[PDB]
A paper describes a structure:
Cytidine triphosphate synthase (CTPS) catalyzes the final and rate-limiting step of de novo CTP biosynthesis, in which a UTP is converted into CTP with the consumption of an ATP and a glutamine. A CTPS protein comprises two domains, the N-terminal ammonia ligase (AL) domain and the C-terminal glutamine amidotransferase (GAT) domain. While the active site at the AL domain activates UTP by phosphorylation using ATP to generate an iminophosphate intermediate that can react with ammonia to yield CTP, the GAT domain mediates the hydrolysis of glutamine to yield NH3 with GTP as allosteric activator. The nascent ammonia is delivered through an “ammonia tunnel,” which connects the active sites at both domains, to complete the reaction.
To reveal the structure of dmCTPS bound by all ligands without completing the reaction (dmCTPS+Sub), we used DON as a glutamine substitute for cryo-EM. We selected 424,195 particles of full-length dmCTPS in the mixture of 10 mM Mg2+, 2 mM ATP, 2 mM UTP, 2 mM GTP, and 6 μM DON. In our dmCTPS+Sub model, the binding mode of DON shows high consistency with glutamine binding in prokaryotic CTPS models, and the covalent bond between Cys399 and DON is observed, indicating that the glutamine binding site is active for the reaction of the thiol nucleophile. The GTP binding site is located at a cleft between the GAT and AL domain, which is similar to the predicted GTP binding position in ecCTPS. At the GTP binding site, the guanine base of GTP interacts with Leu444 of the binding monomer and Leu107 of another monomer through dispersion interactions and forms three hydrogen bonds with the side chain of Arg481. Yet, stabilized by the interaction between Leu444 and GTP, the wing is rather rigid in our dmCTPS+Sub map. However, when GTP is positioned at the binding site, the cleft between the glutaminase active site and the ammonia tunnel is fully covered by GTP, suggesting that GTP serves as a block to prevent molecules shuttling between the interior and exterior spaces of the protein. In our dmCTPS+Sub map, we observe additional electron density merging with the uracil base in the direction of the 4-oxygen atom, which would be phosphorylated in the reaction. Meanwhile, the signal of the γ-phosphate of ATP is missing, suggesting that the reaction of UTP phosphorylation is taking place in our imaging condition. We further focused on residues participating in this transformation and identified Lys16 and Lys38 directly interact with transferred phosphate and Asp70 and Glu145 also interact through a water molecule, supporting previous predictions about their function of stabilizing the anionic transition state during the reaction.
Author numbering:
A (entry chain B), B (entry chain A), C (entry chain C): 1 to 556
């Protein structure tokens, strides 16, 4: 078994996941089976209790585990399906060890970080690396990504573990890549190398030595900076890969092939790759990266959300849209609108912002309402759906735009002024959105409707079903705690609202459609999780098509 | 005695010197005498062997010590005159200690870093802090600036020293300020706080605790980032000063007064300042910062140099020009031209660059040629002077534009094709620039004509003498190793070249003038070192005036 | 070239030098040429300014360099002659680097610890390792001993240096041995392993990994402690050598051969030793270690000194005596007497101590007076010589017993009551001991009569000359600053004092003899430095023989 460890330097958000996915796709293009593991030193059994501000848009697997977006990137790049054990954390490790100790599996011995925590980590990695991930394929290489920055207090065990692992698995099966930021401050006037030097020093102060150093910068750096890094960090100049900021990440693997990473990995890990064969390996990524540069059509979409100050809180969503616009041969122009500025309280405190955001909203071609939690920014998310309804503008809603749209429809058609959520006001007369008491145990954490569930469309042709290929079923990933009230269902169904989808037992609503309206589709699940570069997601596809008035043509 | 220590975080070039100078000028405006010390952990007795790429434009004091530009900033802000002992280095400390040990001043004892190196450091600081610096004034506060980043291997002694010093001088006389970078990477999408956290951790791992944290960013940061820093670095929110990138540094002290640094320092160090008195303290800096924003005249100057890829290699020069253009009520527009692109070798390899740089040079209003060393970029520095001569364009030359201009005049008027330098070709027939053998001992380091020397103008009114106030003498700082050949003097003097200045013995040329030409002045010394915000330097003044055709009017 | 680095753990004085010498003699017995280097991180160009309390009895080489006793051990074990460059220190390194920088050998660059100090260290080691040391032999292995404990602030450069060196010289030519203390506190009740664990952690935190761990204990440790060390320090159980406290150090190499160090070093460094040949390699050390256990004769010697609270302040001396008593087939019984207790001031403050020490002195068979400095304990060192003179007891004096004896003879025979030293009273009427003004420059350090000088005996057979083999000359190592007054020479020579030796110019006294007395020999030089296990030193030989009444028999 072969292992590639990807560590980090100065900051989080430096680009470790993209580098790991690029290594994976390079190796997979040359005829190797690859698996991936993500280590997150935070004390959390999963990322289900995080805000999107913390680490960017919780991702959900099929089994239902909330994880970091790096696993989403792995899935999108390598076309794999990962599990809950591909995400190691300090919380899990300590819980497992404490359980084993309270059982008596080390009776007589003092349980310490070394050897026990590190042993557990190595056993977990060994175990999961051998596990097939794209069928029953036998993985030959594992890419492990160590989260955070070297030097964090939380990740000292893991480092130690791997310092042992490299001697447990025979250096010629282990390689390390350190991703470090090279900043260029405007007032300083030059790219700075000292943070990378200090990070490599901290790394070597734990028994590990880099085999590759990946320098991340906004712009490309000269050979002088490369030489400085090679000399003050003690690696060869051929072992310094400089990956700058690019338009799309599809360019990253190519830029790696252009720098000889395949040859170095075949020489260092002894992969025995026949290279007269390997040409045209990355033709997929070449085609994608090119097509991403030749499209000039400028479809403009609005994203009305409450985390819009940190765009990475909608990563999946964004990428989904891209994967659609590129298959339609269009160029995406994304507009982020903060929901609280669509509310009337801003018209009495800051009218300029109000009118500017409403201008942005009205001069677009399509609206996407993402999911969320809480009560901050939903009463403008309501008005967005209301406007798109009363002005015939395409619309896709995702797990909270559905509920917002239902409440809006109620309050604007059925004269139900108090139609509201339990998450906002639980003591409301007309509760259109109610609590699912199976997932309201008080124990927050794992207590969500999570993972892939089955879809069943009601009878009667539906545009959204035709976009799905007219099947009887489809599996989709859910992540939610509330649910639309089934009681009021027909009170909306006897109007321009139609439930074209629900669960297998026909009492939990998960899709809705507006007749007469070009495109007003909403999904309680997240269709953003199964979109891929060469396999877009039908709802986003239809949204884009409607936004360019090509939906009926594509249907026929 | 009171002490303010200024430490650094993530990178060098973060802004410690400006912060120290701002503290100094704030305290000095409220009626306190201030001195300054700079500690540079590099193993060098002085910065005379550095390239400008390394640490930005060696500065020279009156005594003749080559030092960092932070001392230039101290001098410009506080109006002081500093000495060779205001610059401590590891080399000096180790040399002194080794000498004392080889004498027998610790006979019987093992000489170690602790206690001996740290003791030496503390004794030096104690000694120099009490030394009058603006006369025989008794200093009441010393600002010590520790160079480099906390964590560097070279600065561990110093840190330790100060950890002891704070108990030697009674916490209520000691305060620490940590200047740290807060980066905002484009692809990350948020200001990052982890480097500051790690720097403060490294600092606390040496026994020191910050009393102020100065966060440096390109743009202002919100209260959320401030709260994160205050919580994860364990200081009060009132102790987090956020200094972003500004147009001029004159704004820095004001921005400090706006954040309550004076009150905090009066409460923490017990300065006993009467504040009903202190209003209008910073009126000078307010006037300067304002006038720097109200000037719309756009005088455009060219700087033809060989270090133009790192602008801080001409800091003093730049500032000098500014101090002039603001007193003339003009706005400066600086153009940096690389000299090698003015040479014909680039016309046969990259003609576009050649013609673009020549365009930049020809569409300006004045030319400044700075100093330099070596042979890379002088044959275009020659052509710049030649063009300005044959096209009647104002010109100021500084310590190598003088020699370049002399060689150009020779080769273009006296038909001396081989007129060249010894620094380029020492075996040339016509050597216009020769070696001063008193400063050519082979021992490079301190072996330069350095420091303030006396000027004497030859008889005959000179515009450059009228700009100096028509005195008989003036003291100016020199830093050089070569000198124009006195033999060829009259062969140039019997033409449009005139030596309006030389030393007291009348055999070392230091100024030259071209008759008929509006302004073609050159100085072998550096007039950039004594320019001040409210006391510009006459040569730059005349350059600007000639560049706006206001020189004759100002003369009368 | 092959390198064996010997590092230290918990304390200094743990036994690194003995281990290094043992490695050397093992490799040399199997047909390999070995050289040795000692690195001392203290800031001292040599140990000539140390007290014996600091690091145990300054040793002197032939060239005249004052060094640590580990070099004495190297010389005694391997039969080599070392030079001033076999002793590296931080002071030397920093002086050399600062000189090179003030010359201009890194012009343009900032001089830092990394790379410059570490480079200097590696260049020095490379250079000296190739230098022949026992003729023009070509060394094949170098044993480098890093002084102090891993973790000391002074030795961080060196560690870093070697972390690079191991990759510069190809791991298969580099091996590391870590010597660590394993204490057994009486009240704790078990051998403790945590200090060794922490030392190995600190070592690995600098990029180095042990190839051998040598555990030092007073008594042997069980296999449980060995297993704990092997597991918590991550080496193989065959790589844990346990060297306990032994009667003689001759047993150390044998105990190493008994644990398979030769085979491990031949496998790890690829020495290609033919082992069917190597049997009987350590027969010399076997014979010595045995004979050191079979001798039952109990010759009892007194050592009257002023550093007697730390016995290692006379190491060489002690060993010299041993090397003699074993060749005479006697067992040595050493008594250490503090000189200040022989003085009358103790008879009025602590008479019991006075009388006890005088009892110890009077119930012995021979007296040895060692060298010293200062004035603390010389007026009892005078009385010891006086007693041995007036009671016919053999006596050897070393570089201060000579001066003490001369002063005693003066004050007790020539009625010169004020006969004294300049080191005690420089303003004395009768100055028997005067200052050599060639070595009194004020600059203490290197300003001593040092190194090997030539001996010439005056004409007239002398017992001490017959013990030397009746030659005309002999080279001996000196270390001193004062000298007996040549003026008073004949005033003592016209009595029972006779100068049987002096320099080549016949005006500097270096030996003296008392006629009628069995053995009263004194040497201004140190004959302790050239004594070897199988080549004793004639003065100590004669002292022992006289102490067993076998001197005249051995003469004939
Ligand atoms: O400017 P000051 O006021 O802080 O004064 C300064 C700045 C820097 N230094 C020392 O020079 C070496 C390299 O410095 P340096 O930060 O530039 O590292 P580097 O290798 O060049 O990487 P990088 O590209 O990031 O710059 C280090 O030993 C520093 O301790 C000193 O003594 N005083
Ligand atoms: O993204 P990955 O792939 O590296 O995965 C990551 C990223 C970060 N973390 C952990 O979360 C905490 C704060 O992280 P964090 O870097 O953001 O520090 P902070 O306090 O928030 O300051 P800052 O503003 O600079 O962000 C730390 O304990 C980290 O070790 C983990 O476990 N996996
Ligand atoms: O007794 P207290 O009052 O201090 O309470 C103590 C003593 C020791 N410990 C922990 O047990 C482990 C091994 O301890 P330990 O010192 O014995 O190391 P080791 O591996 O066994 O080597 P060694 O032979 O030197 O003993 C360590 O993780 C200690 O932190 C604790 O928690 N409380
Ligand atoms: N043997 C045993 N030990 C227990 C049990 N429950 C708790 N312990 C603890 O676990 C320790 C076991 O460590 P061991 O090193 O095997 O000592 P031991 O139990 O006496 O076993 P021996 O050393 O073979 O005699 C005991 O000392 C107990 O203090 C139990 O049910 N059986
Ligand atoms: N006294 C003395 N010591 C010297 C001289 N030159 C080098 N040394 C060394 O410096 C050391 C002085 O340390 P001290 O602790 O004072 O020991 P001491 O010199 O014997 O002085 P006392 O302890 O008072 O007897 C000596 O041991 C010498 O090894 C010298 O000229 N005079
Ligand atoms: N060239 C030169 N530099 C000196 C001399 N004395 C001190 N220096 C300093 O050492 C530095 C040399 O560094 P370099 O990187 O070679 O810069 P340079 O001297 O301009 O040489 P080039 O980069 O080739 O133009 C100069 O910038 C000076 O500041 C000298 O006599 N000659
Ligand atoms: N080379 C690159 N060019 C542009 N954006 C990049 C690049 N590498 C990474 N990114 C983006 O930067 C963000 C952070 O990357 P990520 O993989 O999450 O890093 P980490 O795991 O260190 O937090 C993501 O939005 C990612 O798409
Ligand atoms: N607040 C600021 N805004 C703009 N430029 C700044 C600011 N502070 C410092 N600078 C500039 O940044 C550079 C580095 O500052 P300097 O005082 O040399 O810092 P340090 O001592 O850390 O290297 C200088 O050119 C300085 O004028
Ligand atoms: N195995 C041993 N048994 C007995 N004494 C020893 C042993 N090893 C070393 N010693 C003695 O301990 C002292 C310290 O050893 P030394 O070689 O000076 O160590 P280091 O270089 O660590 O200070 C010396 O007197 C030495 O003879
Ligand atoms: Mg991240
Ligand atoms: Mg964060
Ligand atoms: Mg909330
Ligand atoms: Mg700087
Ligand atoms: Mg630098
Ligand atoms: Mg040069
Ligand atoms: Mg020792
Ligand atoms: Mg000691
Ligand atoms: Mg003394």
């Amino acid at each position: 078994m072969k292992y590639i460890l990807v560590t980090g330097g100065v900051i989080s958000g430096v680009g470790k996941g993209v580098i790991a996915s690029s290594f994976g796709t390079l190796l997979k293009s040359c005829g190797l089976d690859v698996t991936s593991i993500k280590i997150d030193p935070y004390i959390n059994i999963d990322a289900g209790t995080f805000s999107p501000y913390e680490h960017g848009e919780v991702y959900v697997l099929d089994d239902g585990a909330e994880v970091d977006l790096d696993l989403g990137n792995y899935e999108r790049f390598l076309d794999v399906t990962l599990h809950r054990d591909n995400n190691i954390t300090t919380g899990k490790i300590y819980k497992l060890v404490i359980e084993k100790e309270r059982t008596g599996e080390y009776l007589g011995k003092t349980v310490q970080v070394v050897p026990h925590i590190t042993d557990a980590i190595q056993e977990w990695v060994e175990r999961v690396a051998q596990t097939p991930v794209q069928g029953s394929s036998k993985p030959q290489v594992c890419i492990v990504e160590l989260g955070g920055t070297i030097g964090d207090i939380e990740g000292m065990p893991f480092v130690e573990a791997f310092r042992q692992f490299q001697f447990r698995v025979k250096r010629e099966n282990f390689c390390l890549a350190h991703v470090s930021l090279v900043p260029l401050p405007k007032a300083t006037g030059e790219p700075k190398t000292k943070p990378t030097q200090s990070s490599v020093r901290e790394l070597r102060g734990c028994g590990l030595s880099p085999d590759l150093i990946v320098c991340r910068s906004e712009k490309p750096i000269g050979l002088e900076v490369k030489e400085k890094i090679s000399n003050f960090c003690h690696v060869g100049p051929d072992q310094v890969i400089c990956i700058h900021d690019l338009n799309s990440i599809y360019h990253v693997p190519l830029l790696m092939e252009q720098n000889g990473v395949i040859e170095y990995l075949n020489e260092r890990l002894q992969l025995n790759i026949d290279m007269s064969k390997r040409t045209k390996c990355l033709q997929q990524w070449r085609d994608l990266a090119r097509r991403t540069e030749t499209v000039r059509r400028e479809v403009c979409i609005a994203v009305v959300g409450k985390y819009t100050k940190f765009t990475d809180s909608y990563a999946s969503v964004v990428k989904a849209l891209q994967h659609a616009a590129l298959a339609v041969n269009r160029k995406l122009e994304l507009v982020f609108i903060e929901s609280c500025l669509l509310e009337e309280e801003t018209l009495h405190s800051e009218p300029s912002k109000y009118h500017k955001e409403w201008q942005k909203l009205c001069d677009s071609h399509g609206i996407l309402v993402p999911g969320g939690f809480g009560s901050r920014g939903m009463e403008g998310k309501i008005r967005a759906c209301q406007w798109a309804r009363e002005n015939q503008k395409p619309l896709l809603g995702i797990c909270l735009g559905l509920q917002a749209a239902v409440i809006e429809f109620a309050r604007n058609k059925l004269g139900l002024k108090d139609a509201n959520t339990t998450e906002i006001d639980p003591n409301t007369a007309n509760a259109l959105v109610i609590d699912m008491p199976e997932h309201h145990t008080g124990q927050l954490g794992g207590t969500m409707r999570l993972g892939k569930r089955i879809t069943v469309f009601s009878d009667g042709p539906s545009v959204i079903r035709q976009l799905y290929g007219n099947p009887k079923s489809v599996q989709e990933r859910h992540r939610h705690r509330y649910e639309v009230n089934p009681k009021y269902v027909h009170l909306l169904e006897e109007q321009g609202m139609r439930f074209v989808g629900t669960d297998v037992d026909k009492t939990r609503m998960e899709i809705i459609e507006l007749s007469g309206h070009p495109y007003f589709v909403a999904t309680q699940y997240h269709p953003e999780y199964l979109s891929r570069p060469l396999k877009p997601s039908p709802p986003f596809l239809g949204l884009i098509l409607a936004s360019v008035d090509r939906l009926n043509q594509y249907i026929q």
